[PDB]
Symmetry: C3
Subunit: 75 residues, 3 copies
């Protein structure tokens, strides 16, 4: 679905909750994450980290592509 | 990984919890979201909104592609 | 953004929290999920399932592509 969704998802969050913020993470993703962490609510970061962790598992669990080979035959 | 995952993720949610639902969001994404919100548990929506917010940060923080230029030289 | 993000997101989780783990879900996604579930904290799984459920809604709500046709005319 490409993008054009964060502004539509952000707005869906900017109207459902007046406390939803998305600070400009202009740094890099590891800065943008530590910034959201060092900036957003530590607890929203707690949850965001868990969101990234779930995001991580999911992608890992659903990474059927990357699969190491093994031993087909017995000997 | 394309799609073919929501039915496999939905099933992973339809078996782990008998209270997991995914109402037909036939409207548009902003209707589908307000529907999940106006339909799903406000608290599941609270969490979903936070999920969209985390989903949003992540994508924003990890959006190394979109980067505004600046001033390389001092003068 | 392709991938090269789970290791950067995992690290963002491996430094923010010393209890963040991502067990090798070498099985399939439905095994990797039931493994994270049967392995990770049931409560982290509770949240991960909710993360997959939110991940699911979002993708479904934002699936403007898949749209069944209807009746344009009245008769």
């Amino acid at each position: 679905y490409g993008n054009m969704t964060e502004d539509h998802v952000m707005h869906l969050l900017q109207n459902a909750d007046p406390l939803k913020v998305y600070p400009p993470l202009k740094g890099s993703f590891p800065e943008n994450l530590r910034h959201l962490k060092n900036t957003m609510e530590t607890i929203d970061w707690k949850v965001f980290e868990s969101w990234m962790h779930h995001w991580l598992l999911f992608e890992m669990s659903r990474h059927s592509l990357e699969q190491k080979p093994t031993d087909a035959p017995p000997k």
